[PDB]
Design a protein around this ligand. Structure first.
Ligand SMILES: Nc1ncnc2c1ncn2[C@@H]1O[C@H](COP(=O)(O)OP(=O)(O)O)[C@@H](O)[C@H]1O
Ligand SMILES: Nc1ncnc2c1ncn2[C@@H]1O[C@H](COP(=O)(O)OP(=O)(O)O)[C@@H](O)[C@H]1O
Ligand SMILES: Nc1ncnc2c1ncn2[C@@H]1O[C@H](COP(=O)(O)OP(=O)(O)O)[C@@H](O)[C@H]1O
Lengths: 72, 429, 99, 437, 434, 65
């Protein structure tokens, strides 16, 4: 006499909430998925938008670049 | 039926601030009732900020706890209008171990002010009927829209961008002629026939290639982070940036001044808002004065619920929890408590906002609860009363159900009365 | 594993074919050689698998089904028999054990 | 088996369908007004139409306030996220005290997301890079062999960088996904295990099924996990993401712009209907330990429209506010926050109701106690405290196992109560010897 | 003459609690003497920990200074056994500038609980005959010899990379794991290494193994929940365990680790065993850690803990109000108090007699009268130090038996705290900050 | 300063390809070589900051920086 498990109790009790699939799923969890491939969820964020004027005149290195030359 | 990120709060029941061309507030407008002088002064401040011809002015809001001045502040923020800079912060939020209090407050003054810059760029968009590529590599594609049909030839880089993202026959996409990034907006209904089937977009209309003027507003703190850090998006979104040098900020201020002198771009003053300023350090209290005395400063409004109280850090008791130096720097607008006649009106409009059907005896007894106790407690009583009415299955809330909820939840004064009897058993009385 | 130190023959009786396939996939990772007997493979492959049971190397077990394994013939070297569950038929356990 | 927990015997509030509180249900007795008061609260959380609500629990220590919090946690179910928090947890050296309270909301609110993924997996028969003039690799050519069939596919130089990162060689089984771009390696096929009698690489059998398979995966993630993923680039295919993966994961503050962008993308997911958002419940125990600054931020926090429901626990009476050094406030909570929170009154248990708790806990511990020892434990419990009689259950059972008795006896309870000292008696003994201390 | 890392100490001589099978305390056993009440209670908590069916319990010990409150905890610590995990932490240790006090408390609670995992692996152990490698993938063979059987195996690419990485040449006894892939060279053969190249490298020699070449071994290990949480939190953080640089681990990772460990217990591959957390002088701990400890103890994985309190009726640090034992009433009422009775004159003679067998110092019968009187007027610790230095001066006089004159010499050399206070009162005006 | 900046490809070459990634600007008016007089003032703090710690701002394209 073999006792059931958590998967057999959840699959047996949750199914009653064809009936032969329960008789086939009583010994082992063939109907339900015991092993399923799992992968982490991937999320993509919208890329940052920077204006052309903010790119040309944006950085402070282009204004002081000659002053930075004098720093070197 | 779906639950949006936003849910009904205390300030969410009102939308906008009701005013008139003569600045005479209505008794009930835009969900707000009463406080004629408060809504008039706040309307004057709103028209001042909408003018935006001056800079570096402060105005304070004062009133008793429960007067809803925070609700008129959030309602003023809603009535401010889109595409205008606004920032909401609290007095306790500026304290952080990662960044100094002065760099955090100055960071708020930077986030408040913003700049509007307009550009023009050539962008192609439309449905792609066919694509051909021959491998340098030479290929040609067909761009068809409802109005016209065109054929284009691609270079090496364009062929690389095409082979990077595969596009099938008859797919509506947007091709940028500047960067070279191809983005597929959708698939045509007729061309998408015969896959994932993610989305469907109709064929675009108009000219294929147009020059669009892009209106883009950037923040001074955003530009300052972008320039200071190697990657300002990773610095700002990561939060690792802090203690930015003031020399770079001054250079950016001079360059923005040069931009305004050129006239190619314009600067838009922002609206800073500070909550619970009754408790704050004299370092920030003193720094607000000079920060407002700076050339370019946003227009701010601060809320203080408490009255005369000792400020934090010193043993001196300041009036209104603020030193006289900052008190004389700004103007104060005091709010009066709500009238009994306005209380039942607020209760009724909260019934309309929360979709609750009550009776006149319910509004009368709840009005008594508003007379003996603060209105917020009654607003918290009706919310739990609707559910008890649902358990009673009745289509209208009853005074008996209001008595059941009133028996379930007790006021702070009552909990104080029982806590006086059980206080000896409580720890550290 | 207790029968591994023994080293007798083991036969598994399964009414469901999916349990026999999962038993082959689970027994394949354990480095345990075996053979499946069902109503699928041809009588030639089943005849070769039944004829290869004499002095079979590394195969200590056999997979069988109610009707397919209880069809007929015999298993000479088989000793330990394990039933997965009842066949929902009378005497089917004794007839399946007769092989 | 599972280790016995103090609150494990509490299965919920134990309320009927009419909302009234039964005398003994779900392992809880007494507190009919408190449980009946929570019966509307669980209907509010299950209703989800309201936000920014805070319910304070006021009662003496040991009256089951935490048992009511965890009882509601068990009543709402496993789908409803429940986040416990202690007043001493908000203090951290890495991040500010406010950032913890702000992150506890995102950690409270849960989100269910369905993701459709296309999978290409199987044995790799051949892999070769293409060569293009700038010696750069423009494209990749990799064939896939499976029991169903063989199909050659082309991959990008980034995917090839992930393959060379995984040390992928010909004759191995790999796992490739499209939208995420990550590359995994299952292992070498079992067919090649016979050529070497000794090998370090483990062998896996050849998978079955079609190479390309589209499948739906329903995952439950929290807005705080999403907020950390968007906050720092820990995961990814970038070499900088690998270096940061090697770097220490210190806590950092999240910007309000990132939070608003999260609200935007999640709002778009709700508009698409693929993602299902569920509200959470934030529990705060020992709220009197929280700082007046934390309460000051709780003013705006509770008034927020997106804030999940928050329950507070206060076991103390009038006390000095933390940091004020002068002003004392009821329940350690200032009048500003205390006016906003909803207070629930809790009453001490009666001498008759205490013995039932002693019996229920005695049965939960697996101990057989006679009626005489039950009446004695109830008597001494009413003399001093309930917690004491609760703690005297196990040692008396130990003495029963030592003496061989099947049940506890008055001599066992008398010996255990003789060994252990009550707080009152000990505090009285500290007075005589206090000069020596 | 060889001295280990361990040396004689105050609580080190205790080999256990000295309890019978009935758990009734014995007067003198396992290096502990007297205090039958606290010895019996310590037996109750030891039998309770050995039961391990109940979790989340706190036991407090209080009494006068010098009653052996630490000696009891060391007694149960040594009597608990090596296979059961034990952790002793101090209130000042959890205070750190790198990580928060509550996080240190979580590291203590998760650190006390041990996890025992068993592993069965088949390894190959034998003496190498020859090694051949072909480089064009490199393919080579490895021929091994044992007294029972001589074997020949083929090497793969990763195997050749591992052996060449380990600098393995013919004539060395090595151990190779098939499933793991690790190779560990034990040594070289005497006869096979007797004839070597002119390089002449002398390192080590190992005899040829006997029996089957490939054998199955079982190696059991224990891993802490904090260790697993650091390893999986730091993303290959194996160095961060010994480095201690990790801190402020996210709670979600800890929850997932708890759920996965629960799944492991359901699978039966790994077992969970209880552990003890000893805290001394907890009265100085901040009240915040107490409020976090009361609610944090309610967890199912929270092990039973034992605290000790030296004083009573003292205000808590950070609060201006006094509380018994420097602990709030919530925690003080939350745990059971075990009082220790002060020792008597009869027990002191036996305590001082234990040092005779422990320190191997012959004591005269006349020395126990004056030494016992010094134990009555002064502290038993000062009596033990008087025994040690008295034995030093006894060796200085080269006597086998202790003489009273030597004890008078040590008593003249060292003064009691009360005496140093008496002289400090006369010279106190010249002393700084009187 | 010795710096080099690339504005874009000449407008005359824009008609050969229907689709090209490089932007096109008209031929800039003015002399090829322009002589101007610029007087720059630099505080000591910026010099001491750039020379205090390694700058690392030589190449932004580097992944290590
Ligand atoms: N003009 C108004 N009309 C209706 N209700 C209001 C109005 N102003 C405030 N309230 C009520 O006041 C509550 C918030 O008050 P609050 O801003 O906290 O007061 P205080 O600023 O004095 O603390 C809201 O729930 C809202 O229903
Ligand atoms: N009504 C009740 N019925 C059964 N057990 C209770 C009840 N109230 C409290 N308990 C038990 O008493 C124990 C101590 O309660 P405690 O958490 O100290 O209460 P509080 O949180 O109010 O201080 C808890 O483990 C709980 O299981
Ligand atoms: N039960 C005991 N058996 C033997 N020696 C003891 C015992 N209890 C205390 N001692 C001795 O007393 C000395 C001082 O004990 P101490 O650590 O001051 O006790 P406490 O920690 O209770 O103050 C120790 O060196 C120890 O050897």
């Amino acid at each position: 006499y073999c006792q059931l498990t958590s998967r057999q109790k959840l699959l047996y009790q949750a199914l009653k909430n064809l009936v032969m699939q329960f008789r086939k799923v009583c010994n082992h969890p063939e109907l339900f998925e015991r092993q399923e491939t799992w992968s982490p969820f991937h999320i993509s964020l919208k890329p940052y938008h920077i204006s052309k004027f903010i790119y040309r005149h944006g950085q402070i290195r282009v204004f002081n670049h000659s002053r930075d030359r004098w720093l070197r | 039926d779906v639950t949006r990120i936003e849910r009904i709060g205390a300030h969410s029941h009102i939308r906008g601030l009701g005013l008139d061309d003569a600045l005479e507030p209505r008794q009930a407008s835009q969900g707000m009732v009463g406080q004629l002088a408060a809504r008039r002064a706040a309307g004057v401040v709103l028209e001042m900020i909408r003018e935006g011809k001056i800079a570096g002015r402060a105005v304070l809001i004062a009133g008793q706890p429960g007067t809803g001045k925070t609700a008129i502040a959030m309602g003023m923020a809603q009535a401010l209008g889109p595409d205008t800079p606004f920032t909401a912060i609290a007095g306790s939020e500026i304290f952080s171990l990662e960044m100094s209090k002065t760099e955090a407050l100055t960071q708020a003054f930077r986030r408040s002010i913003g700049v509007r810059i307009k550009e023009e760029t050539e962008i192609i968009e439309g449905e792609v009927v066919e694509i051909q590529i021959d491998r340098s590599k030479v290929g040609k594609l067909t761009l068809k829209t409802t109005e016209m049909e065109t054929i284009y030839d691609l270079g090496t880089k364009m062929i690389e961008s095409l082979t990077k993202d595969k596009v099938q026959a008859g797919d509506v996409i947007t091709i940028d002629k500047a960067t070279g990034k191809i983005s597929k907006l959708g698939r045509s209904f007729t061309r998408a026939r015969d896959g994932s089937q993610t989305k469907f977009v109709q064929c675009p209309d108009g000219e294929l290639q147009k020059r669009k003027e892009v209106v883009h507003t950037v923040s001074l703190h955003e530009i300052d982070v972008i320039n200071s850090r190697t990657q300002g998006f990773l610095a700002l979104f990561s939060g690792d940036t802090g203690e930015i040098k003031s020399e770079v900020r001054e250079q950016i201020n001079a360059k923005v001044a040069e931009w305004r002198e050129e006239g190619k771009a314009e600067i838009i003053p922002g609206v800073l808002f500070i909550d619970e300023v009754h408790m704050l350090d004299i370092e920030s209290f003193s720094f607000l004065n000079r920060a407002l005395e700076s050339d370019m400063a946003p227009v701010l409004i601060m809320a203080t619920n408490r009255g005369i109280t000792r400020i934090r850090g010193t043993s001196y008791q300041s009036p209104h929890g603020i030193p006289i130096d900052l008190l004389d720097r700004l103007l104060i607008v005091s709010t009066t408590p709500y009238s009994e006649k306005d209380t039942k009106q607020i209760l009724r409009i909260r019934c309309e906002e929360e979709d609750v059907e009550m009776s006149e005896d319910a509004y009368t007894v709840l009005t008594r609860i508003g007379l003996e106790t603060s209105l917020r407690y009654a607003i918290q009583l009706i919310t739990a009363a609707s559910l008890v009415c649902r358990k009673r299955k009745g289509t209208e809330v009853q005074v008996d159900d209001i008595k059941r909820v009133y028996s379930l939840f007790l006021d702070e004064s009552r909990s104080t009365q029982y806590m006086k009897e059980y206080q000896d058993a409580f720890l550290f009385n | 594993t207790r029968l591994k130190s023994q080293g007798h023959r083991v036969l598994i009786y399964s009414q469901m074919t999916r349990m026999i396939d999962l038993l082959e996939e689970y027994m394949v990772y354990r480095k345990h050689t075996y053979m499946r007997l069902d109503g699928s493979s041809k009588i030639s492959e089943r005849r070769d698998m039944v004829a290869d049971f004499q002095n079979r190397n590394d195969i200590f077990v056999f997979l069988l089904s109610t009707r397919a394994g209880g069809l007929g013939i015999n298993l000479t070297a088989a000793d330990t028999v394990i039933f997965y569950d009842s066949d929902w038929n009378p005497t089917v356990d004794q007839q399946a054990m007769d092989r | 088996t599972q280790r016995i927990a103090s609150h494990s015997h509490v299965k919920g509030l134990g309320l009927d369908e009419s909302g009234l509180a039964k005398q003994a249900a779900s392992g809880l007795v007494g507190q009919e007004n408190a449980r009946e008061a929570c019966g509307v609260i669980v209907e509010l959380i299950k209703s989800k139409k309201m936000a920014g609500r805070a319910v304070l629990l006021a009662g003496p220590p040991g009256t089951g306030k935490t048992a009511l919090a965890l009882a509601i946690a068990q009543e709402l179910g496993s789908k409803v996220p429940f986040c416990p928090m202690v007043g001493s947890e908000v203090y951290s050296t890495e991040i500010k005290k406010t950032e913890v309270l702000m992150e506890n909301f995102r950690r409270a609110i849960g989100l269910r997301i369905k993701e459709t993924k296309e999978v290409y997996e199987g044995e790799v028969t051949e892999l070769t890079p293409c060569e293009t003039e700038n010696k750069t690799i423009s494209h990749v050519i990799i064939g896939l062999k499976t029991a169903k069939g063989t199909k050659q596919l082309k991959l990008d130089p980034s995917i090839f960088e992930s393959l060379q990162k995984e040390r992928v060689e010909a004759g191995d089984v790999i796992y490739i996904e499209a939208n995420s771009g990550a590359v995994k390696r299952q292992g070498r096929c079992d067919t090649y295990a016979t050529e070497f009698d000794l090998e370090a690489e483990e062998y896996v059998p050849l998978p079955k099924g079609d190479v390309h398979k589209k499948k739906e995966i329903i995952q439950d993630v929290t807005l705080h996990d999403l907020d950390v993923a968007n906050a720092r680039p820990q995961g990814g295919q970038d070499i900088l993401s690998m270096m940061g993966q090697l770097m220490k994961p210190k806590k950092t503050e999240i910007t309000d712009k990132l939070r608003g962008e999260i609200n935007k993308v999640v709002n778009k997911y709700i508009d698409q209907g693929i993602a299902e958002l569920v509200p959470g419940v934030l529990f705060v125990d020992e709220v009197h330990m929280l700082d007046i600054e934390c309460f000051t931020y709780l003013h705006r926090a509770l008034e927020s429209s997106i804030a999940p429901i928050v329950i507070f626990a206060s076991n103390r009476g009038n006390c000095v506010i933390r940091g004020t050094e002068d002003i004392t406030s009821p329940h350690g909570i200032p009048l500003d926050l205390l006016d906003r929170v909803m207070i629930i009154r809790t009453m001490l248990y009666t001498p008759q109701e205490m013995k039932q708790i002693i019996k229920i806990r005695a049965q939960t511990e697996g101990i057989n106690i006679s009626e005489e020892a039950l009446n004695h434990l109830g008597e001494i419990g009413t003399k001093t405290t309930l917690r004491y009689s609760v703690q005297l259950l196990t040692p008396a059972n130990l003495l029963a196992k030592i003496n061989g008795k099947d049940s506890i006896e008055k001599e066992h309870v008398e010996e255990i109560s003789e060994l252990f000292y009550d707080a009152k008696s000990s505090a009285k003994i500290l007075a005589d010897q206090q000069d020596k201390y």
